[PDB]
Coordinates of C-alpha atoms in Angstrom, one line a residue:
Chain A
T24 CA 138.3 104.9 147.5
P25 CA 138.8 101.5 145.9
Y26 CA 137.3 98.5 147.7
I27 CA 140.1 97.0 149.9
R28 CA 139.5 94.0 152.7
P29 CA 140.0 95.0 156.1
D30 CA 143.1 92.4 156.2
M31 CA 144.5 93.5 153.1
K32 CA 144.3 97.4 154.5
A33 CA 146.1 96.5 157.8
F34 CA 149.1 94.5 155.7
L35 CA 149.7 97.6 153.3
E36 CA 149.5 99.8 156.6
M37 CA 152.1 98.1 158.1
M38 CA 154.1 97.8 155.0
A39 CA 154.2 101.9 154.4
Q40 CA 155.8 102.4 158.0
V41 CA 158.6 100.1 156.8
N42 CA 159.3 102.4 154.1
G43 CA 162.0 100.4 152.5
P44 CA 164.8 101.4 150.1
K45 CA 163.4 101.3 146.3
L46 CA 164.9 98.5 144.7
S47 CA 167.2 100.8 142.4
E48 CA 168.6 101.7 145.8
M49 CA 169.8 97.8 146.6
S50 CA 172.5 95.6 145.8
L51 CA 170.9 92.8 143.3
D52 CA 171.7 90.7 146.3
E53 CA 170.3 92.7 148.7
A54 CA 167.1 93.2 146.5
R55 CA 166.9 89.3 146.3
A56 CA 167.2 88.6 149.8
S57 CA 164.7 91.4 150.6
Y58 CA 162.2 89.5 148.8
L59 CA 163.0 86.3 150.1
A60 CA 162.2 87.9 153.4
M61 CA 159.4 89.7 152.5
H62 CA 157.6 86.2 151.4
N63 CA 158.9 84.6 154.5
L64 CA 157.5 87.2 156.8
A65 CA 153.7 87.3 155.1
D66 CA 153.4 83.8 153.5
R67 CA 152.2 80.9 155.6
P68 CA 154.8 78.3 156.0
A69 CA 155.8 75.4 153.6
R70 CA 154.0 72.3 153.8
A71 CA 156.2 69.2 154.8
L72 CA 156.0 66.9 151.5
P73 CA 157.6 63.4 151.1
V74 CA 159.2 64.9 147.8
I75 CA 161.0 68.1 147.8
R76 CA 163.8 67.4 145.3
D77 CA 166.8 69.7 143.6
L78 CA 167.8 68.7 140.2
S79 CA 169.1 70.3 137.2
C80 CA 168.3 70.2 133.4
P81 CA 170.3 70.9 130.5
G82 CA 169.4 74.8 129.0
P83 CA 170.5 76.9 126.3
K84 CA 173.4 78.4 128.2
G85 CA 174.2 75.7 130.6
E86 CA 172.2 73.6 133.3
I87 CA 169.1 75.3 134.6
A88 CA 168.0 74.5 138.4
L89 CA 164.9 72.9 138.9
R90 CA 163.0 71.6 142.2
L91 CA 160.4 68.8 141.9
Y92 CA 157.4 68.9 144.8
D93 CA 155.2 66.0 145.0
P94 CA 152.6 65.2 147.8
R95 CA 152.7 61.4 147.0
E96 CA 155.5 59.3 148.2
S97 CA 155.2 57.6 144.5
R98 CA 153.8 58.6 141.3
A99 CA 154.4 56.2 138.5
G100 CA 151.7 56.3 136.1
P101 CA 150.8 59.1 133.3
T102 CA 150.0 62.3 135.2
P103 CA 149.9 66.0 134.0
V104 CA 153.0 67.7 135.5
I105 CA 152.5 71.4 136.8
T106 CA 155.5 73.7 135.7
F107 CA 155.9 76.6 137.9
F108 CA 157.5 79.8 136.9
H109 CA 158.3 82.6 140.1
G110 CA 157.3 86.1 139.9
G111 CA 160.0 88.7 140.5
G112 CA 160.1 91.3 137.3
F113 CA 162.6 88.7 135.6
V114 CA 165.1 90.3 138.2
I115 CA 164.4 88.9 141.5
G116 CA 162.8 86.0 142.9
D117 CA 164.0 82.2 142.9
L118 CA 163.2 78.4 144.2
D119 CA 163.1 79.6 147.9
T120 CA 161.1 82.8 147.4
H121 CA 158.1 81.0 146.0
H122 CA 159.0 78.0 147.9
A123 CA 155.8 77.7 150.3
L124 CA 153.5 78.7 147.6
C125 CA 155.1 75.8 145.4
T126 CA 154.3 73.0 148.3
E127 CA 150.7 74.7 148.7
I128 CA 149.9 74.3 144.8
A129 CA 151.4 70.7 144.9
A130 CA 149.4 69.6 147.9
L131 CA 145.8 71.4 147.0
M132 CA 146.3 69.9 143.4
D133 CA 147.6 66.7 144.3
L134 CA 150.0 66.9 141.4
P135 CA 153.6 67.1 140.7
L136 CA 155.0 70.4 140.2
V137 CA 158.5 71.4 138.8
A138 CA 159.7 75.2 139.7
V139 CA 162.3 76.6 137.4
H140 CA 165.2 79.0 138.3
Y141 CA 165.2 80.8 134.8
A142 CA 167.9 83.3 133.9
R143 CA 167.5 86.5 136.0
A144 CA 167.9 90.0 134.1
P145 CA 170.0 92.1 134.3
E146 CA 173.0 89.8 134.3
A147 CA 171.0 88.4 131.6
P148 CA 168.5 90.3 129.8
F149 CA 165.6 89.5 127.8
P150 CA 165.1 87.1 126.2
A151 CA 167.0 84.8 128.5
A152 CA 164.3 84.0 131.2
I153 CA 161.8 83.1 128.4
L154 CA 164.4 80.7 126.5
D155 CA 165.1 79.1 129.9
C156 CA 161.6 78.7 130.9
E157 CA 160.8 77.4 127.6
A158 CA 164.2 74.8 127.7
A159 CA 162.7 73.4 131.1
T160 CA 159.2 73.0 130.0
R161 CA 160.0 71.2 127.2
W162 CA 162.5 69.2 129.1
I163 CA 159.9 68.1 131.7
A164 CA 157.2 67.0 128.6
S165 CA 159.9 65.0 127.3
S166 CA 159.5 62.4 130.6
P167 CA 163.3 62.3 131.4
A168 CA 164.2 59.8 133.6
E169 CA 165.9 62.0 136.3
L170 CA 162.6 63.2 137.0
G171 CA 160.8 59.8 137.3
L172 CA 157.6 61.2 135.9
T173 CA 155.3 59.9 133.0
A174 CA 154.0 63.5 131.7
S175 CA 150.7 63.2 129.8
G176 CA 150.5 66.9 129.8
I177 CA 151.8 70.4 131.0
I178 CA 150.1 72.7 133.6
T179 CA 151.9 75.8 133.4
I180 CA 151.7 78.4 135.9
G181 CA 153.3 81.3 137.4
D182 CA 152.6 84.8 139.1
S183 CA 153.9 88.2 137.5
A184 CA 156.5 88.1 135.3
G185 CA 156.3 84.3 135.7
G186 CA 152.8 84.6 134.3
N187 CA 154.4 86.5 131.8
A188 CA 156.6 83.1 131.2
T189 CA 153.6 81.3 131.3
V190 CA 151.9 82.7 128.3
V191 CA 155.2 82.9 126.3
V192 CA 156.2 79.4 126.8
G193 CA 152.3 78.2 125.7
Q194 CA 152.8 80.4 122.9
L195 CA 156.1 78.9 121.9
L196 CA 154.6 75.2 122.5
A197 CA 151.5 76.2 120.9
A198 CA 153.6 76.9 117.5
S199 CA 156.2 74.2 117.9
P200 CA 154.9 71.5 120.5
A201 CA 156.7 69.8 123.1
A202 CA 156.5 66.0 123.5
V203 CA 153.1 66.3 125.5
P204 CA 150.6 69.3 124.9
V205 CA 149.9 72.2 127.4
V206 CA 146.9 71.2 128.8
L207 CA 146.4 74.3 131.1
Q208 CA 147.8 77.5 131.5
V209 CA 147.3 79.8 134.6
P210 CA 148.6 83.3 134.4
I211 CA 148.5 84.8 137.9
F212 CA 148.3 88.5 137.7
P213 CA 150.1 88.4 134.7
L214 CA 152.5 90.9 132.6
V215 CA 150.8 90.1 129.1
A216 CA 150.0 94.0 127.8
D217 CA 152.3 96.5 128.1
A218 CA 150.8 98.5 131.2
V219 CA 152.4 101.9 130.8
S220 CA 149.2 104.0 130.1
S221 CA 146.8 101.9 131.5
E222 CA 144.2 103.0 133.8
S223 CA 145.2 100.7 136.6
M224 CA 148.6 101.8 136.4
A225 CA 147.3 105.4 136.8
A226 CA 145.2 104.5 139.8
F227 CA 147.2 101.7 141.5
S228 CA 151.0 103.0 140.8
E229 CA 151.7 104.0 144.7
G230 CA 150.9 102.5 147.9
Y231 CA 149.5 98.9 146.9
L232 CA 152.9 97.2 147.0
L233 CA 154.0 97.0 143.4
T234 CA 155.1 100.6 142.5
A235 CA 155.8 102.6 139.4
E236 CA 159.4 102.8 140.7
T237 CA 159.4 99.1 140.5
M238 CA 158.1 98.5 137.6
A239 CA 160.5 100.7 136.1
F240 CA 163.4 99.1 137.5
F241 CA 162.0 95.4 136.3
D242 CA 161.6 97.5 133.2
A243 CA 165.2 98.9 132.4
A244 CA 167.0 95.4 133.5
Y245 CA 165.0 92.8 131.5
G246 CA 165.0 95.5 128.6
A247 CA 161.9 93.3 126.4
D248 CA 161.4 95.0 122.9
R249 CA 158.1 96.4 122.8
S250 CA 156.9 94.9 119.7
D251 CA 158.1 91.3 120.4
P252 CA 155.6 88.8 121.4
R253 CA 158.1 87.2 123.7
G254 CA 158.3 90.5 125.7
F255 CA 154.4 91.1 125.3
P256 CA 152.5 88.1 124.5
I257 CA 149.2 89.9 124.0
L258 CA 151.2 90.6 120.5
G259 CA 151.4 86.6 120.2
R260 CA 148.9 84.1 118.8
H261 CA 146.0 83.4 120.4
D262 CA 143.4 81.4 118.5
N263 CA 145.2 78.2 119.4
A264 CA 145.7 79.2 123.3
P265 CA 145.6 76.5 125.6
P266 CA 142.5 76.0 128.4
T267 CA 143.3 79.1 130.2
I268 CA 142.6 80.5 133.6
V269 CA 143.6 84.3 134.1
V270 CA 144.0 85.4 137.6
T271 CA 144.1 89.5 138.5
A272 CA 143.9 91.2 141.7
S273 CA 141.3 94.4 141.8
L274 CA 144.2 96.8 143.5
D275 CA 147.1 95.9 141.0
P276 CA 148.7 98.3 139.0
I277 CA 149.0 95.6 136.2
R278 CA 145.4 94.6 136.7
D279 CA 144.4 95.8 133.0
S280 CA 147.2 93.4 131.5
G281 CA 145.7 90.6 133.0
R282 CA 142.4 92.0 131.8
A283 CA 143.5 92.3 128.0
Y284 CA 144.5 88.9 128.1
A285 CA 141.2 87.1 129.0
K286 CA 140.0 89.7 126.3
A287 CA 142.0 88.6 123.6
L288 CA 141.6 84.8 124.4
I289 CA 137.5 85.6 124.0
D290 CA 138.2 87.6 120.7
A291 CA 139.7 84.4 119.6
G292 CA 137.3 82.1 120.7
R293 CA 139.3 80.3 123.3
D294 CA 137.9 79.2 126.7
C295 CA 138.7 81.3 129.8
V296 CA 138.1 81.3 133.2
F297 CA 138.6 85.0 134.3
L298 CA 138.8 85.5 138.3
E299 CA 139.4 88.9 139.8
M300 CA 139.7 88.8 143.2
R301 CA 138.3 91.7 144.7
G302 CA 140.1 93.7 147.4
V303 CA 143.8 92.7 147.2
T304 CA 146.8 93.7 145.8
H305 CA 149.3 92.4 143.2
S306 CA 151.5 89.2 145.3
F307 CA 148.3 88.4 146.9
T308 CA 149.3 84.6 146.3
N309 CA 152.2 84.9 148.9
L310 CA 150.4 86.6 151.2
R311 CA 148.8 84.2 152.8
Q312 CA 149.6 84.1 156.8
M313 CA 149.4 88.1 157.3
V314 CA 146.2 88.6 155.0
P315 CA 144.5 85.4 155.8
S316 CA 141.7 86.0 153.2
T317 CA 144.3 85.7 150.1
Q318 CA 144.5 81.7 151.3
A319 CA 140.7 81.4 150.1
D320 CA 141.4 83.4 146.9
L321 CA 144.2 81.0 146.1
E322 CA 141.7 77.9 146.7
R323 CA 139.2 79.0 144.4
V324 CA 142.1 79.3 141.8
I325 CA 143.0 75.6 142.8
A326 CA 139.4 74.4 142.5
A327 CA 139.2 76.1 138.9
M328 CA 142.6 74.4 137.7
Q329 CA 140.4 71.1 138.9
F330 CA 137.3 71.9 137.0
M331 CA 139.3 72.9 133.8
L332 CA 141.4 69.5 133.8
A333 CA 138.6 67.5 134.8
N334 CA 136.4 68.8 131.8
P335 CA 138.3 69.5 128.4
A336 CA 136.6 70.5 125.8
Chain B
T24 CA 136.3 76.6 106.1
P25 CA 134.8 76.9 110.0
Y26 CA 135.9 74.0 112.4
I27 CA 132.8 71.5 112.4
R28 CA 132.3 68.3 114.2
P29 CA 131.6 65.2 112.0
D30 CA 128.2 64.7 114.0
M31 CA 127.2 68.3 114.1
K32 CA 127.9 68.4 110.1
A33 CA 126.0 65.4 109.7
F34 CA 122.9 66.7 111.3
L35 CA 123.1 69.9 109.2
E36 CA 122.9 68.2 106.0
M37 CA 120.3 66.2 107.4
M38 CA 118.4 69.2 108.0
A39 CA 119.6 70.7 104.4
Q40 CA 117.6 67.8 102.8
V41 CA 114.1 69.0 104.5
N42 CA 112.0 70.9 102.2
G43 CA 109.6 72.8 103.8
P44 CA 108.2 76.6 105.1
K45 CA 110.5 78.7 107.1
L46 CA 109.3 80.0 110.3
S47 CA 107.9 83.3 108.9
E48 CA 105.9 81.4 106.4
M49 CA 103.8 79.6 108.8
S50 CA 101.0 80.3 110.9
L51 CA 102.2 81.0 114.4
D52 CA 100.8 77.9 115.8
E53 CA 102.7 76.0 112.9
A54 CA 105.9 77.4 113.8
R55 CA 105.7 77.0 117.2
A56 CA 104.7 73.4 116.6
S57 CA 107.6 73.0 114.5
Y58 CA 109.9 74.1 117.2
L59 CA 108.8 71.6 119.4
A60 CA 109.3 68.8 116.7
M61 CA 112.5 70.0 116.0
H62 CA 113.6 69.5 119.7
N63 CA 111.8 66.3 120.0
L64 CA 113.7 64.8 117.1
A65 CA 117.0 66.1 118.3
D66 CA 117.3 66.1 121.7
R67 CA 117.7 63.3 124.3
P68 CA 114.6 62.1 126.0
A69 CA 113.7 63.7 129.4
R70 CA 114.8 61.9 132.2
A71 CA 112.3 60.4 134.7
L72 CA 112.0 62.7 138.0
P73 CA 109.8 62.3 141.0
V74 CA 108.4 66.3 140.8
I75 CA 107.7 67.5 137.4
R76 CA 104.8 69.9 138.2
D77 CA 102.7 72.4 136.7
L78 CA 101.6 75.7 138.5
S79 CA 101.3 79.6 138.0
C80 CA 102.3 82.8 139.8
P81 CA 101.0 86.2 139.5
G82 CA 102.3 88.5 136.8
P83 CA 101.9 91.9 135.6
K84 CA 99.4 91.1 132.9
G85 CA 97.7 88.0 134.7
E86 CA 99.0 84.5 135.7
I87 CA 102.6 83.1 134.6
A88 CA 102.8 79.7 133.6
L89 CA 105.3 77.6 135.5
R90 CA 107.0 73.9 135.7
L91 CA 109.1 72.9 138.8
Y92 CA 111.5 69.9 138.0
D93 CA 113.1 68.5 140.9
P94 CA 115.0 65.2 140.9
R95 CA 114.3 64.9 144.7
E96 CA 111.4 63.1 146.1
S97 CA 111.3 65.5 149.2
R98 CA 113.3 68.7 149.8
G100 CA 115.8 72.9 154.0
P101 CA 117.5 75.8 152.2
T102 CA 118.2 75.4 148.9
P103 CA 119.3 77.4 145.9
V104 CA 116.7 77.3 143.0
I105 CA 117.6 77.3 139.2
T106 CA 115.0 79.6 137.0
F107 CA 115.3 78.7 133.5
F108 CA 114.3 80.7 130.7
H109 CA 113.6 78.9 127.3
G110 CA 114.9 80.0 124.0
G111 CA 112.9 81.1 120.8
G112 CA 113.6 85.0 119.8
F113 CA 110.9 85.4 122.4
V114 CA 108.5 84.4 119.7
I115 CA 108.5 80.6 120.0
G116 CA 109.1 77.9 122.4
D117 CA 107.3 77.0 126.0
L118 CA 107.4 74.4 128.7
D119 CA 107.6 71.5 126.4
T120 CA 109.9 72.3 123.8
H121 CA 112.9 72.7 126.4
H122 CA 111.3 70.0 128.5
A123 CA 114.0 67.5 128.1
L124 CA 117.0 70.0 128.9
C125 CA 115.3 71.2 131.8
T126 CA 114.9 67.7 133.2
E127 CA 118.9 66.9 132.5
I128 CA 119.8 70.4 134.3
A129 CA 117.7 69.4 137.3
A130 CA 119.1 66.1 137.3
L131 CA 122.8 66.7 136.8
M132 CA 122.7 69.5 139.4
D133 CA 120.7 68.0 142.0
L134 CA 118.8 70.9 142.3
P135 CA 115.1 72.1 141.5
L136 CA 114.6 73.9 138.7
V137 CA 111.4 76.2 137.8
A138 CA 111.1 77.0 134.0
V139 CA 109.0 80.1 133.0
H140 CA 106.1 80.1 129.9
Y141 CA 106.9 83.6 129.2
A142 CA 104.6 86.0 127.3
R143 CA 105.6 85.4 123.8
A144 CA 105.9 88.0 120.8
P145 CA 104.1 89.1 118.2
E146 CA 101.2 88.9 120.2
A147 CA 103.2 90.6 123.4
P148 CA 105.8 92.7 121.9
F149 CA 108.9 94.0 123.7
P150 CA 109.3 94.2 126.6
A151 CA 106.6 91.9 127.7
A152 CA 108.7 88.5 128.0
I153 CA 111.3 90.4 130.5
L154 CA 108.5 91.5 132.5
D155 CA 107.2 88.0 132.9
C156 CA 110.7 86.6 133.7
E157 CA 111.7 89.1 136.0
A158 CA 108.4 88.9 138.1
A159 CA 108.5 85.2 137.9
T160 CA 111.8 85.2 139.3
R161 CA 110.8 87.7 142.5
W162 CA 108.2 85.1 143.3
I163 CA 110.4 82.3 143.1
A164 CA 113.0 84.2 145.2
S165 CA 110.2 84.7 148.0
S166 CA 110.0 81.0 148.8
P167 CA 106.1 80.9 148.2
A168 CA 104.0 78.3 149.8
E169 CA 102.8 77.0 146.3
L170 CA 106.6 76.1 145.4
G171 CA 107.5 74.2 148.6
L172 CA 111.2 75.5 148.6
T173 CA 113.1 77.5 150.8
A174 CA 115.0 79.7 148.6
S175 CA 118.7 80.6 149.6
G176 CA 119.4 82.4 146.3
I177 CA 118.7 82.0 142.5
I178 CA 120.6 80.7 139.7
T179 CA 119.3 82.1 136.1
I180 CA 119.9 80.3 133.0
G181 CA 119.0 80.1 129.5
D182 CA 119.5 79.6 125.8
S183 CA 119.8 82.0 123.3
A184 CA 116.6 84.8 123.9
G185 CA 116.6 83.1 127.5
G186 CA 120.2 84.1 127.5
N187 CA 119.1 87.8 126.7
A188 CA 116.6 87.5 129.5
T189 CA 119.0 85.6 132.2
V190 CA 121.3 89.1 131.9
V191 CA 118.1 91.4 132.1
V192 CA 116.7 89.5 134.8
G193 CA 119.8 89.9 136.6
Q194 CA 120.3 93.7 135.9
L195 CA 116.8 94.4 137.2
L196 CA 117.3 92.3 140.3
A197 CA 121.0 94.2 140.7
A198 CA 119.4 97.5 140.7
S199 CA 116.4 96.5 143.0
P200 CA 117.3 93.2 144.4
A201 CA 114.5 90.3 145.3
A202 CA 114.2 88.5 148.5
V203 CA 117.5 86.6 148.1
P204 CA 120.6 87.5 145.5
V205 CA 121.1 85.8 142.3
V206 CA 123.8 83.8 143.3
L207 CA 124.8 82.6 140.0
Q208 CA 123.7 83.4 135.9
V209 CA 124.5 81.2 133.0
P210 CA 123.6 82.7 129.7
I211 CA 123.9 80.5 126.8
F212 CA 124.4 81.4 123.5
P213 CA 122.8 84.8 124.3
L214 CA 121.9 87.8 122.7
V215 CA 123.7 90.5 125.2
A216 CA 124.8 93.0 122.3
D217 CA 123.0 93.7 119.1
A218 CA 124.3 91.4 116.3
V219 CA 123.6 93.2 113.2
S220 CA 126.9 94.3 111.8
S221 CA 128.7 91.7 114.0
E222 CA 131.4 89.5 112.3
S223 CA 129.7 86.5 113.3
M224 CA 126.4 87.5 111.7
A225 CA 128.4 87.9 108.2
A226 CA 130.2 84.7 108.6
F227 CA 127.6 82.4 109.9
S228 CA 124.2 83.6 108.5
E229 CA 123.1 80.8 106.5
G230 CA 124.0 77.3 106.7
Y231 CA 123.9 76.9 110.8
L232 CA 120.7 76.2 111.9
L233 CA 120.2 79.6 113.1
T234 CA 119.7 81.8 109.7
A235 CA 119.3 85.6 109.0
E236 CA 115.7 84.9 107.9
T237 CA 115.2 83.5 111.2
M238 CA 116.4 86.4 113.0
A239 CA 114.8 88.6 111.0
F240 CA 111.8 87.2 111.5
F241 CA 112.3 87.0 115.3
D242 CA 113.4 91.0 115.2
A243 CA 110.2 91.7 113.4
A244 CA 107.9 90.6 116.0
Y245 CA 109.6 91.3 119.4
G246 CA 110.7 94.8 118.0
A247 CA 113.4 95.2 121.2
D248 CA 114.2 99.0 121.7
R249 CA 118.2 99.4 120.7
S250 CA 118.7 102.2 123.3
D251 CA 117.0 100.1 126.3
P252 CA 119.0 97.8 128.2
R253 CA 116.5 95.4 128.5
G254 CA 116.2 94.8 125.1
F255 CA 120.3 95.1 124.7
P256 CA 121.5 94.2 128.4
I257 CA 125.3 95.3 126.8
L258 CA 123.7 98.7 127.7
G259 CA 123.5 97.8 131.0
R260 CA 125.6 97.8 134.2
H261 CA 128.0 95.5 134.6
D262 CA 129.8 96.4 137.8
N263 CA 127.4 94.4 140.3
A264 CA 127.0 91.7 138.0
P265 CA 126.5 88.0 139.6
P266 CA 129.0 85.5 139.1
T267 CA 128.6 84.3 135.3
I268 CA 129.3 81.5 133.2
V269 CA 128.8 83.1 129.7
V270 CA 128.7 80.4 127.0
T271 CA 128.9 80.4 123.1
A272 CA 129.1 78.2 120.2
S273 CA 131.5 78.7 117.6
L274 CA 129.4 78.4 114.3
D275 CA 126.8 80.7 115.6
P276 CA 125.9 83.9 113.9
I277 CA 125.5 85.5 117.3
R278 CA 128.5 84.0 119.0
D279 CA 130.2 87.7 119.0
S280 CA 126.9 88.9 121.3
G281 CA 128.1 86.5 124.1
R282 CA 131.9 87.2 123.4
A283 CA 130.9 90.7 123.9
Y284 CA 129.3 90.4 127.4
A285 CA 132.3 88.5 128.8
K286 CA 134.4 90.9 127.6
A287 CA 132.2 93.7 129.2
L288 CA 132.5 91.6 132.7
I289 CA 135.9 91.7 132.5
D290 CA 136.2 95.4 131.8
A291 CA 134.3 95.6 134.8
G292 CA 136.0 93.6 137.0
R293 CA 133.8 90.9 137.6
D294 CA 134.5 86.9 137.3
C295 CA 133.4 85.3 134.2
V296 CA 133.8 81.6 133.3
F297 CA 133.9 81.6 129.2
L298 CA 133.1 78.8 127.5
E299 CA 132.9 78.7 123.5
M300 CA 132.0 75.1 122.1
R301 CA 134.0 74.3 119.1
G302 CA 132.4 72.6 116.3
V303 CA 128.8 73.0 117.0
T304 CA 125.9 75.7 116.2
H305 CA 123.4 77.9 118.2
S306 CA 120.9 75.3 120.1
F307 CA 123.3 72.7 120.6
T308 CA 122.1 72.2 123.9
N309 CA 118.8 70.7 122.5
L310 CA 120.6 68.4 119.6
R311 CA 121.9 66.1 122.4
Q312 CA 120.7 62.8 120.5
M313 CA 121.2 63.7 117.2
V314 CA 124.7 65.4 117.5
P315 CA 125.6 63.0 120.6
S316 CA 129.0 65.3 121.5
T317 CA 126.5 68.1 122.8
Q318 CA 125.9 66.0 125.7
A319 CA 129.3 66.5 126.8
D320 CA 129.3 70.1 126.0
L321 CA 126.3 70.4 128.4
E322 CA 128.4 68.2 131.2
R323 CA 130.8 71.1 130.6
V324 CA 128.8 73.9 131.6
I325 CA 127.2 72.1 134.6
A326 CA 130.7 71.4 135.9
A327 CA 131.5 75.2 135.8
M328 CA 128.0 75.6 137.5
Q329 CA 129.3 73.1 140.3
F330 CA 132.6 74.7 140.1
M331 CA 131.2 78.5 140.7
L332 CA 128.9 77.7 143.3
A333 CA 130.8 75.6 145.5
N334 CA 133.9 78.4 145.1
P335 CA 132.3 81.8 145.5
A336 CA 134.5 85.2 145.9

C-alpha cells in the first residue's frame, strides 16, 4: 500500500462515493463546468486582491483572454512577471477553474501574475494551446502598455497540462528569446515525457483522481505527435534550460513524467529543485480546503521559488 | 572548449606555471602540507568567531579529533552541522578546511563540528567512514563536552567528505542516532564510481583535480567497489534525508554527483541539484583567488536555509 496522508485518503474515499461520469460521457460544456465545480468544492476560496483584471492580447488566431493578478495596489518599477498556464489536459480548465490558486500564488509571491486562457482541444487540437501560451508569454515579456508592468523577466508556472506548456514555452523562448528571459520555470505535476508505459501509470491509474480513462480522453482530444518536442518536451533541448523547480506528487500516475524531466536537466548540468510531495495525488494544488495539508505543500513550492529568484546562478 | 569563468581560467593558468612534484611523488607529510598551502593561498581568510575549540570524542580505534565552530558567544535546541573535509581520504585535516568551516558556521548562524577522521594509506577503507559515523553519532547524543542540545544533524562535506556525507546518512538511516539527519549537503561528492564516466574522460587533465591525483587517492584508500560504504550509489535511497547535491561543471567526477541526484529522484526523494557553471572541483576553497566562488557558496547556504525552514 503506497503511503497516503489521512486527509488525502478521506478525500479519495469521498470522491469514490460520488462515482461521477467519465469525461468521455459528458458534453464538453458539462466536463468544463464539472471541473470548475470540483475546484470550487475542494480548494480554498480566492483571496481578495486590489488588482484582478481581465484583458486580452493579440494571438495567432485572434485575441487571447488573460487575467492579471496583483496583491499590490501599484507596481510601476521593473519586476519579474509570473505567467500561469492552467491544467486540464488541454481540454478543460479556464481562468475561473484556477482562479483561487492564482490569487494564492500572486499573494504569497508578492508578484504580478498573468493567467492565460489558451485555445483548448478538441475544438483546437495540438499545437494550438502551445502557440497561444507562447504568444501570450512573448507579449507579456514585451512590457505592453495595456498590462502596465515593466517586466525584467518571466516566471513560467503551470499545473499538469499547464506544466507541459511551461516547459514547451521555455524551450521555444530558449531557442528564440523574448524581450526578457525566463528567469524561473515551475512545472507542477507536469506531463513532460510520454507516460503510457511508466511504472507510475501502472501503479496509480485508478483510484487516485487522475485515471487512465481521463488520460486517454485528453490524449485523443489533443492529438499531440509522439516525436514532436512541442508535444512531449522531454524530447526538447535541455542544456540551456532556465532555472527550474520540478514538483511531482507521489500518488500520481504521471509522476514518472516529471521525474524524467528533473533527471534530464541533471544530465544537462542544469540547476533543478526537485520536490516530490509525499502522500498526495495529482491536482493537489487545488485541494487546499478539503485536503488541508496541501496548503503546506504549496507553501514549500513558494519558498523554493523565492530561494531560486533571490539566488541566481 | 568547455565554458570556464575568466577568474577560474586565470587561476588555472597560474597553477599551470608551478613546476613541482605531483602529490604521489611527495612524502605523505609533504603532500598533506602542500594541500594546506594550496587552500591557504586560494581561499578567503578565516572568520573571527567567538568559539573555535579543539576537542575529541571516542572512536572505534581511539580518540577522534574534532573542532567546534560557533559564531555565537552563547547558545537551547539547535541543529548541529557535522562537516567532513575533502582530500581523497588521504590528505586534508582540520586546518586545510578551517576557513571554509568558519564561513559556513557564520553564514548559517549554526554550530559546526569538523571531524579529523582516520586517513589512508595508514588506515585504509573503511576507516574514514567509521570515524565519520562515530563522530556524528556522538555529536547527535548532545554530549556535555560539546555544550549543545542537538535537535538534528546537518551533514556536509566536499569531495571525499561528500562521499562520507552520503555514507553517514545511509548508516544512520539504517540505524538512527539520537536525533535524525535533517539535511545532507554533499558537495562535488564521489557517490558512484567515476572510472568510466564521461566527465572523467573530458576533465581528467587541466582542471585542478587530475586523473593522476584520483589514481593516487584510489591506490591509498582502496574502496571496495561492491560496498555501499565505498560507493553509496549502491545504498538505500528511498529513506534518504533532505538533500542538496552540489556539483561543478568542470569536474572529472561531476557525473558521480549527478548520478546521486538522479538516484534520489528515482526514489521519490526531494533534492536540490546545483551545478556551478564554469568552475572546477574544490571551488568552495578558492574564494580569494577565484572571487566568483564566494557567490557560489552563498547560493548553497541559501539552499540550506530554504530546506531547513521548509521541511516536507
